[PDB]
Write a protein that binds this DNA or RNA. Structure first.
Lengths: 329, 594, 331
DNA sequence: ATCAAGCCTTCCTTCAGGTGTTGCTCCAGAAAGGGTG
DNA sequence: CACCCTTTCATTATTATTATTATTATTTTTTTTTTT
C-alpha cells in the first residue's frame, strides 16, 4: 500500500536544525571568528548521494522536513479531524496513558514493558489508528510508514528516480529570513502612549535607564540579564516548491487506508515543520497517487470509495475502550 | 447501476463516475469543468445530465455547435424523462431561408426542385429536419440545409434571412413564433452564439430564459470564441460601396485607413489621423439616406455598417483592420479584448453549469487557463478529473523519423520536409494528412510535392476551404487511391476523419492512416482577447494554447475505439532538440510508445 | 477563518533587507569593485519557485513584506485601536513587563523553560488577544498565523492558486530611489540666514573649515563623519496588488472578530518602513472570510457574529489576564 | 511642371570615502518526599 | 490508595563550523462562424 502525496508549499518551510549556526550581515554562513557574526538556526538539511552532473554520486545538501515530523502531523490530523469529532460525538473520554498513546505514542501510561497477548496484538493492529501508530507500553508495530517530505530537486533526483524529472527544481533551495524583536519601550513616545503603563512615565524611564545600564555593562564586558532587542536569522526553504511524500502501509486493513485518506482530505488546515507565527508550512496538495494511480481531486479524494466506507464503519465503531486497553493493561 | 440517472444506461462505462461527479457538483451550483475524449460518447452524457437536471424542475439549456445539435437531440429523443418534460430547439435568423429571394433565384437559374419546394410552404425534406420537427413539435420550414440539399451552389448569404425582411413572409413569421420555444419545453438546445447573443441581449436590458437553472455546454473550448464573435462588429467597405452605387467621405475614410506587418492591432484610440471625423461623417451620411426606395436587402447592409460604425463610436472597444483572402479589400473591425462583464453576466444567470469539451485542461485538471478564458467565477469553478482512455493512444503508431531542418519558412526546410512527407506517403497504405501551420509553409510544401505526388496531392489555401478538401479527401479514399492532404486552419481542430461508410466495423476504418505534424502550432490564435491574455500572462499563455492546438491536431487520429495501425509522425526538430520551452509537447508525446 | 486580504499600496513599500549592498550611479545592483559605489538598502526579497517559460521551474526573487513584520503590524493595530483604548476607558492598567509582553511577545529575554498550567494555556488561548499572540515568558502557541505580504505577481503564481490570474503583475517590480542628505550650512547664503546660529558667521565658517579639513582627510585616506551622505534604497513600486493570508487554528469568534476589527483599523496604518518618506500607506480592496468576500468601501459589512463576540470580549477585557500572562515563573 | 534639396562643433563637470543596534534566549531529569483528596 | 508535586547529583572544560558562494533577456502571423 503505497501513497505518493505531492504537495506545494504556499508559504516557506522552516524545520529548525540543531546547532549554533552563525551568519554575517551578508549571506556568509558560519564565518571565521573575529568578525561580527549573528545567531542562526537553519532548516533541517542532510547530505544525500546524488548522481548529478556525472556518473559518480556526491554528498549534496538537501533541505527537507524529517519523517518524524510528518508522521506526527499525519497522526495529529487524524486525531483532530477524525478521532476528535467521531469520539466526541459518542461521548468517550481518554485517560492519561490513552491520550499519551494516541497523541504521543509514549509509554507514560505505565512505564514498564507491557506483555501483550497475540489476540490483543492482532486486533489492535487490525484496529485502524492503533494499527497505524502502535507504540507506548505495548510497543506495538506501526502499520503506517511515513517517508520524509522530499522536494522535487536535483539533490533528491535519485530518491525520485523515475517520473520526476519534469517540474524539478535546481540550484539553491534555502534563503535566510531575518527577524528582529525590538524593545517596544523604545517605540513609545506620546503622553497618550504611556498612560496605560502602571507607573507611567517614571516606569518607562526606569526601563530606559535599566536598558542603558545593561548596554554599558555589556560594552564593558566585551572589552546576565538581557533586554528585549534581538536580531537573528533563520534559513527557510523557499515557497512554491513541490514536495513528495511516501506513505507505505505494511499489509493494511481497509479502514487504515480510509483513515489515511481522510487525513489527506482534511490535512489542508494544518501545517508543516512549525514556524507557526511566521505562518510557515502553509501548503496545498497537488496530487495523491494510491499505488501509482492518481486519486486526488481539488475537493478531496475522488475514488477509493471502499476505503471511505471502511473508515466510515470504523469511526462509527470507534470507541475509547480500545485506546484504554492499548494503554493500561 | 443502482439509483440510476435517466439515460445513464446508454452511457459508456468508463465515464459513469464522471457523470456522477458532474451531476453532483452541478446540482450543488458549481460550474463543472468536465473533460472527456472524443470517442467516449459525450453526447449520451449531456443527454443524461440534462435529463437528470430536467426532472428536478430546472429550466435546462444545452449550448452546442449546430453540427453537434442533431446528434444531441438524437441522444435525448427517446429517454422518457425528457419525453415528459419536453425538448425544444432555439434558432436565430441565419437558420432560415428567404422564400421570395430564393424563388427569384430558382426561376433565374432554372432549378425545378427548389422552386417546387418553396411553392407550397417550404416543407421540411431532409430526414434531420422532419425528426427534429417531430421532437420540437414545430414544423421546421424554410431551413438552409433543405435548400442546400436541392441546390448546393446557392448564394447563401444573399438568400440568408435578414432582420429587414418583411413581416408577412412565412420564414420571419416562423422564426418570430419559434422565439417563444423556451416556454413550452424544459430543455432548450441552442448554439454557443445564440447563448452569447442572449447574454448581450440581457446586458442591453425572450430568446432564452432570463435565469438558466442548469446549463450544459458541449464543445466548451469554442464558447469563449463565440463571445469574441458577437461582441465584434465589422465594417465591410466594398459591399457598402457597391450598395450605395445601386459617399466621398467613406472614400476618404478608406484613404485614411491606408496610412495606419501589424496594421492597427489592439489599439482603441491611440491613432486618430482622421479616423473619428471620417467615422462621424460615415455615420451621418449612412444614417440619413432615405429608407423609402431602399431595397429590402440593402438596408441590412446599411444597418450592419452603421452598427459597426457606432460600435467604433463609443471608444469602449478596440479597432483592427483586416483584408479578405480573395483580394486586398479594406476591413474595419471593432472587437473587444476584455469579456469579463459579458461572461460574468452569463454566469450570474446560471445556477449550475457543466464545462464539457475534449480540450479543457492544460496539465492534469488545471483548468485555470480555460476558467480565465470564459471568466468563470473561481468560487463557482470546479475542474473535474478528466478521462483519457488507453484506447485513444493504443492504436497510434509513433515513428522516430523526422525532418532535421526546423521550419523557418525556408526553401531548404520545405525540400527536406517534402522528402519526409514523400517517405510517409510511400509507406502509407491509406489516407495521409500532414498538418502545416502557415499558408507560406503550405504553399512551399505544395510547390515541392505537387509534381512529386501527381494527382494524390490535395492543397488547402485561400481558394480551397477545409470542407471542400474534406469531401475531396473522402472522394479519393472512395476511389481507392491514397490521398495526401496539406491541411491547416480547421484541419487542425474540428474535422471528423472517421469513415461513416464503416459504422459497425472500426477495425477496417482506413480514412486516416498517417497523421503528420510538420511544426508545433505556436501562435495559431490571434484574437483580441487571446492577445490581451498573452500580454497579461506572457509566454505561458502562448505555450499553453500551443499545447492545446497540438493536442487538438493529435486528436484527428483516433475518433472511436477499435481502430488499428494508426501512424503518427512529428517532424518539428524542436521535438528532438534539448530546448526547454518545447517541454510540454514531450509529455503528450510521452503517452505513446515505440 | 482563513482570512485573505488584498491591500493596494498607494505609496512605495520599503521593508529593508539586511546586508551590505551597493549600487553604481547608473543603477546596477552590487557592482564589481573598483567603480564608484553607493550603499543600497534593498527591499525585502524572498526567493520563490515559479513558472518561467513552461516547466523550467526556478527560484526568482519576489519582493515581499515579512510575515513577522505584518504580524507585528496586525498586533499593533489591534493593540493601538482596540485593546488599549478598551483598557484605559476603564481603570485597568498594565505593568511595563506586561506591556512588553503584549507588544514584543515577552517581557524580557532569557525565557523560563518551566511550562505553564493547562487551565492557564486554555484560558490564554480563549483570550481575544493572548490566544492570537501567544508570547509570554512560558512560550505559548498563539493561534494567529500571519502570512508574508505577496504582490499579486506572475512569480507568485504557485503561491496563489486561482482567482488571481487577472489583476496580476509581471516583470521587474521595483525602483531604486536615491537620497542626497545635503549639508545644511552649505546652503547658508547671507547674514539674515545666519542670525539664529550662535556666533553667526564665525561658527558657520568654522564648521566650513572643519568640512574642508575632513575633505583633505578623505583625500589622504583615498590617496568624524560629515553630513553629506548620498545613497540609494530599493522600494517596491506603488499601486501593486498584494495578498495577505491570516490563519486561525480553531479560533474563538471573538478572536477572529479582533482580527476583523483590527482590519477595520488597517486603513491609515503603515506596512513596512520609510516613515519619513510616507512609504507603506495602503488601501484594502478586499477581505475574504473562508473565501467569502466581506469587504465594502465603508468597512466590513459582514462577519457580524465575530463582531459581537469581540465586542462582548472587549468589555470583558481586563488587565488580570495580561498580568498573569506576563508573570515569570522564575521571577 | 524643377532646382537647391544644410552646413560646422558642440559629444560635460564637480559631489556622493554612509554610519548606528542588531553580534540570542529556554528546555529537552528522573528520583524520592509530603500533603492532599 | 493511586496520583501530583518539589528539589538533589556532576564538575567536563574547549568549541571545529558547508568556504559553500549569492538577483535575467523566448513566438510570431490564422480566416473562422451561422447572431442581432
Amino acid at each position: 500500500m503505497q501513497i505518493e502525496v505531492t504537495v506545494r508549499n504556499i508559504t516557506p518551510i522552516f524545520s529548525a536544525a540543531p546547532g549554533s549556526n552563525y551568519i554575517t550581515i551578508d549571506g556568509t554562513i558560519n564565518p571565521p571568528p573575529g568578525v561580527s557574526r549573528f545567531p542562526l538556526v537553519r532548516t533541517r538539511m542532510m547530505y544525500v548521494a546524488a548522481d548529478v552532473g556525472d556518473g559518480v554520486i556526491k554528498s549534496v545538501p538537501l533541505q527537507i522536513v524529517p519523517g518524524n515530523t510528518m508522521r506526527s502531523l499525519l497522526r495529529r490530523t487524524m486525531l483532530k479531524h477524525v478521532i476528535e469529532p467521531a469520539l466526541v460525538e459518542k461521548g468517550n473520554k481518554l485517560s492519561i496513558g490513552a491520550y499519551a498513546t494516541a497523541y504521543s505514542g509514549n509509554a507514560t501510561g505505565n512505564p514498564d514493558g507491557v506483555p501483550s497477548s497475540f489476540d490483543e496484538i492482532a486486533t489492535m493492529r487490525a484496529h485502524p489508528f492503533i494499527g497505524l501508530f502502535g507504540g507506548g507500553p505495548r510497543m506495538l508495530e506501526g502499520r503506517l510508514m511515513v517517508d520524509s517530505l522530499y522536494p522535487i530537486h536535483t539533490n533528491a533526483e535519485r530518491i525520485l528516480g523515475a517520473g520526476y524529472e519534469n517540474e524539478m527544481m535546481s540550484g539553491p533551495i534555502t534563503q535566510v529570513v531575518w527577524a528582529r524583536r525590538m524593545d517596544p519601550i523604545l517605540n513609545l513616545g506620546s503622553s497618550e502612549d504611556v498612560e496605560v503603563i502602571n507607573g507611567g512615565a517614571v516606569a518607562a524611564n526606569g526601563w530606559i535607564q535599566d536598558l542603558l545600564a545593561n548596554s554599558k555593562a555589556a560594552a564593558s564586558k566585551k572589552k546576565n540579564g538581557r533586554g528585549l532587542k534581538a536580531f537573528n536569522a533563520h534559513e527557510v526553504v523557499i515557497p512554491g516548491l513541490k514536495w513528495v511524500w511516501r506513505i507505505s502501509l505494511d499489509r493494511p486493513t481497509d479502514a487504515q487506508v480510509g483513515l489515511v485518506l481522510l487525513a489527506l482530505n482534511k490535512m489542508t488546515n494544518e501545517r508543516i515543520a512549525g514556524g507557526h507565527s511566521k505562518d510557515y508550512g502553509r501548503f496545498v496538495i497537488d496530487g495523491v497517487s494510491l499505488n501509482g494511480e492518481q486519486v486526488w481531486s481539488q475537493s478531496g479524494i475522488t475514488g477509493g470509495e471502499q476505503y471511505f466506507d471502511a473508515v466510515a464503519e470504523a469511526i462509527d465503531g470507534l470507541s475509547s475502550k480500545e485506546f484504554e486497553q492499548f494503554a493500561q493493561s | 447501476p443502482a439509483d440510476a440517472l435517466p439515460g445513464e444506461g446508454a452511457v459508456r462505462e468508463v465515464l459513469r463516475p464522471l457523470l456522477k461527479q458532474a451531476a453532483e457538483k452541478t446540482a450543488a451550483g458549481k460550474i463543472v469543468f468536465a473533460e472527456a475524449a472524443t470517442g467516449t460518447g459525450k453526447g449520451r452524457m449531456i443527454a443524461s445530465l440534462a435529463a437528470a437536471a430536467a426532472i428536478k424542475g430546472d429550466t435546462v439549456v444545452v449550448s452546442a455547435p449546430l453540427a453537434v445539435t442533431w446528434q444531441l437531440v438524437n441522444d435525448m429523443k427517446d429517454i422518457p424523462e425528457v419525453r415528459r418534460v419536453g425538448l425544444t430547439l432555439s434558432l436565430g435568423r441565419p437558420n432560415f431561408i428567404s422564400p421570395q429571394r430564393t424563388l427569384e433565384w430558382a426561376i433565374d437559374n432554372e432549378r425545378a426542385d427548389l422552386a417546387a419546394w418553396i411553392e407550397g410552404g417550404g416543407k421540411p425534406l431532409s430526414l434531420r429536419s422532419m425528426e427534429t420537427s417531430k421532437v420540437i413539435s414545430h414544423e421546421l420550414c424554410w431551413l438552409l440545409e433543405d435548400a442546400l440539399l436541392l441546390a448546393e451552389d446557392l448564394p447563401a448569404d444573399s438568400l440568408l434571412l435578414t432582420s429587414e425582411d418583411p413581416a408577412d413572409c412565412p420564414a420571419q413569421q416562423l422564426y418570430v413564433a419559434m422565439r417563444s420555444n423556451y416556454t413550452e419545453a424544459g430543455i432548450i438546445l441552442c448554439s454557443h452564439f445564440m447563448l452569447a447573443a442572449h447574454t448581450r441581449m440581457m446586458q442591453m436590458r425572450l430568446s432564452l430564459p432570463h435565469f438558466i437553472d442548469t446549463l450544459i455546454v458541449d464543445e466548451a473550448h469554442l464558447l469563449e470564441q463565440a463571445f469574441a464573435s458577437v461582441y465584434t462588429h465589422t465594417l465591410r467597405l466594398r459591399p457598402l460601396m457597391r450598395t450605395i452605387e445601386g459617399l466621398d467621405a467613406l472614400k476618404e475614410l478608406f484613404t485614411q485607413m491606408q496610412v495606419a506587418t501589424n496594421t492597427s492591432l489592439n489599439v482603441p484610440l491611440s491613432d486618430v489621423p482622421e479616423l473619428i471625423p471620417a467615422l462621424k461623417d460615415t455615420v451621418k451620411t449612412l444614417g440619413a439616406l432615405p429608407t423609402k426606395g431602399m431595397s429590402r436587402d440593402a438596408r441590412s447592409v446599411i444597418r450592419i455598417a452603421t452598427r459597426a460604425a457606432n460600435d467604433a463610436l463609443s471608444g469602449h472597444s478596440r479597432l483592427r483592420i483586416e483584408v479578405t483572402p480573395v483580394h486586398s479589400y479594406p476591413m474595419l473591425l471593432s472587437g473587444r479584448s476584455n469579456l469579463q462583464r459579458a461572461l460574468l453576466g452569463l454566469w450570474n444567470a446560471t445556477g449550475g453549469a457543466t464545462l464539457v469539451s475534449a480540450t479543457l485542461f492544460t496539465t492534469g485538471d488545471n483548468g485555470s487557463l480555460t476558467r480565465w478564458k470564459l471568466e468563470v467565477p473561481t468560487e463557482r469553478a470546479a475542474f473535474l478529473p478528466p478521462v483519457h482512455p488507453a484506447w485513444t493512444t493504443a492504436p497510434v503508431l509513433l515513428h522516430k523519423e523526422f525532418c532535421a531542418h526546423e521550419p523557418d519558412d525556408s526553401p531548404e526546410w520545405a525540400t527536406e520536409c517534402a522528402q519526409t512527407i514523400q517517405g510517409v506517403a510511400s509507406t502509407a497504405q491509406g489516407g495521409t494528412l500532414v498538418l502545416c501551420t502557415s499558408y507560406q509553409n503550405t504553399e512551399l510544401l505544395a510547390g515541392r510535392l505537387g509534381a512529386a505526388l501527381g494527382d494524390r496531392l490535395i492543397v488547402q489555401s485561400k481558394t480551397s476551404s477545409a470542407a471542400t478538401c474534406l469531401a475531396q479527401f473522402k472522394a479519393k479514399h472512395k476511389a481507392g487511391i491514397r490521398p495526401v492532404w496539406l491541411g491547416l486552419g480547421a484541419a487542425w481542430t474540428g474535422i471528423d476523419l472517421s469513415d461513416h461508410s464503416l459504422p459497425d466495423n472500426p477495425e477496417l476504418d482506413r480514412l486516416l492512416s498517417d497523421l503528420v505534424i510538420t511544426r508545433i502550432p505556436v501562435g495559431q490564435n490571434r484574437s483580441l482577447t487571446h492577445e490581451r491574455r498573452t500580454a497579461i500572462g506572457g509566454f505561458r499563455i502562448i505555450s499553453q494554447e500551443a499545447a492545446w492546438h497540438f493536442r487538438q491536431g493529435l486528436g484527428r487520429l483516433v475518433r472511436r475505439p477499435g481502430v488499428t495501425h494508426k501512424n503518427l509522425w512529428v517532424l518539428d526538430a524542436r521535438i528532438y532538440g534539448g530546448a526547454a520551452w518545447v517541454a510540454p509537447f514531450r509529455q503528450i508525446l510521452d503517452r505513446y510508445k515505440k
